[PDB]
Design a binder for this molecule. Structure first.
Ligand code: MG
Ligand code: MG
Lengths: 396, 396
């Protein structure tokens, strides 16, 4: 008790160092206040903050015991009275994810520069993936009222340097995300279902043009939906099952859902597409919630119309809110993932809105953007590491 | 590309070091594979693993640029070709929590010793609390089939050294706990309600004796319940509300529940006590589930009997299972907290069974034991830090 002492051990890592130090300290009236240790690339840092009798800390014996024991095996140690020293470091305010393929040193350099410019302190850096993409996390302490400036600065770095850069709240509450919705077309599934339907009518051309036109936000979603589905007027309803069986999951989708289930997420899809194509898949993927539009069928033939209500841009956010209320999950703990202007209100409503290989209209307002063709890069944004994924998967 | 290089920077921390290094690296064909950085007690370690042209890595220029830039400002740097080097470290297998007041160096020394003896590697150490108790976390890599030996060895250390020591699975799945049940008497609430009831009958003596006798497991819970409640025969039912208003929460209980709500836990209580005393509190604490026994009342007077079914030792586990099924939470992601032999089957059924200031009968089989009069020390076992609690609370 009485007086506090800081002991700092550094150098090339060797086994037994940790036990040796506290065994030495036990010969003095040492009680512990804080221990921090890590080994990085065979470099040990062990910082031990203690209190011990004023008697002991004022004597050369504690110093000599520690210095002798540490220096003998080949490491460095410093010892100094503290008293005016933080016992335990404060939590980081935010975390930053940098994803690239590659991540140039220039890219990472620009991130570190923007960070320093805004008075943001880097508390820790670690890797979170080596595949399918290089992933690096920085946990940071952002000055109050500066994280807007920071997201802006880092989105600029992101486009200039060809990496994804996401800044997230690192508070207890915001980290415990519990619910996720995916847009279907070009997010969970490869391509555009409505274009696969249109191709059966020899209309993939017209419909692709309008689809690409609607997802960039240059058109009202409902009017574009009505013109596109009209091109299907006269197709037999059998086409629906046929397109259902041609659907390819986005690379990384099974891994994304599976891992999200391990974490107890409630998972759903919210689509402007069609319930009949989506359900025999949501069932196969064991999803908890589906919202979608519905094709009108007369005499076993599509009419080219949709049965209202239409899930539009507002409808997607409305669906998220509905799902979250039923699931008992506050909006702050919800995640939304999408690629088109169709998805803007949904990402905005969600706690974390993630644009996945998205049109500019969506990236401009999303909380975070992903530019690589791997849906499982979403998991990294959710605080999961690749190693953790592979571990849990290997355990089966 | 072509060839991999490891750059390791160590020394006294200074601002701008991180940006400086990658700015230097950008003058060479450097792409990043992994960055690890931490500062502990003003000691910087920055390990950067890269790939760069064989051209560049075989030349003195990369070395000279880096060495000049790092050494100038006063830090150390090493540079060496890798190629046969782990890109990204594997996740820890387990985590160990050491809680004490105090934690002697001897105590921590014994933990580190038992760890090394079983071939367990310490991957990281950090503090998780300075109040109400000193809390230290070690994340470790345990050899397969040794974690039984490890829990045994550390429970022995725990009793000999007067610290709590808990060993937990650190896998993705097991970390995402989502549901917690508390025993009420001497766990969530101070003291024994049945003794507070008995005192109104001038019987606190007899009933305390039997209560302490049942919680150590020396008696059948049902027979002990029947003898104790019988002592209440003839009390007016008004006594129930009176005892309800004399109930004191366990120190740390509000903080425990509040923080658990932030994390999206479903929270419940499972008691051998009485529904009428418990409900006007579970409601006040916004709990999701209550299971309890029920006092028989005739003509507004207690009869001294309970209305079956009796929640016994088996009944508590049965209640947990019920709660978890309704809540949609797998048993592995459930937590149970209790103090008496009454709670043994419940802790055993739960993913994580925590004995809180418990009788020996329960500590002997619990996953983890807590010996300090602070229920919020449960939170530390759930991967929460004190700083994180205070942060979120300050944000309100
Ligand atoms: Mg889409
Ligand atoms: Mg109890």
């Amino acid at each position: 008790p009485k007086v506090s002492v800081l002991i700092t051990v550094t150098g090339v890592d060797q086994p037994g160092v940790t036990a040796t130090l506290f065994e030495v300290l036990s010969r003095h009236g040492v009680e512990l206040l804080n221990v921090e240790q890590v080994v990085i690339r065979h470099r040990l840092t062990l910082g031990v903050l203690v209190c011990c009798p004023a008697d002991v800390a004022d004597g050369p014996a504690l110093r000599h015991d520690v210095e002798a024991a540490i220096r003998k095996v080949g490491l460095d140690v410093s010892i100094e009275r503290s008293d005016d020293v933080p016992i335990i470091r404060e939590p980081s305010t935010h975390t930053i994810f940098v994803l690239g393929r590659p991540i140039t040193a220039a890219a990472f350099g620009a991130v570190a520069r923007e960070v320093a410019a805004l008075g943001v302190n880097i508390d820790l850096i670690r890797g979170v993936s080596d595949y399918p993409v290089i992933g690096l996390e920085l946990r940071v302490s952002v000055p109050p009222g500066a994280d807007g400036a920071l997201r802006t600065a880092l989105n600029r770095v992101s486009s200039e340097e060809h990496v994804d850069v996401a800044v997230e709240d690192y508070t207890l509450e915001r980290r415990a995300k519990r619910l996720i919705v995916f847009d279907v077309d070009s997010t969970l599934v490869q391509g555009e279902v409505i274009e696969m339907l249109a191709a059966k009518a020899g209309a993939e051309g017209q419909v692709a043009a309008i689809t690409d036109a609607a997802m960039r936000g240059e058109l009202d979603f409902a009017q574009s939906l009505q013109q596109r589905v009209a091109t299907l007027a006269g197709l037999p309803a059998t086409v629906i099952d046929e397109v259902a069986g041609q659907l390819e999951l986005m690379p990384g989708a099974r891994t994304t859902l599976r891992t999200l289930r391990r974490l107890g997420y409630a998972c759903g899809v919210v689509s402007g597409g069609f319930r009949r194509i989506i359900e025999p898949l949501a069932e196969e993927l064991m999803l908890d919630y589906v919202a979608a539009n519905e094709l009108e069928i007369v005499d076993g033939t599509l009419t080219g119309r949709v049965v209202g209500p239409i899930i539009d841009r507002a409808g997607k956010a409305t669906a998220l809110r509905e799902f979250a209320q039923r699931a008992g999950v506050p909006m702050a703990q919800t995640v939304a993932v999408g690629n088109g202007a169709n998805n803007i209100d949904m990402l905005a409503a969600a706690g974390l809105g993630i644009a996945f290989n998205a049109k500019p209209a969506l990236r401009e307002v999303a909380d975070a953007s992903l530019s690589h063709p791997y849906l499982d890069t979403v998991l990294f944004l959710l605080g999961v590491t690749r190693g953790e994924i592979e571990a849990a998967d290997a355990i089966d």
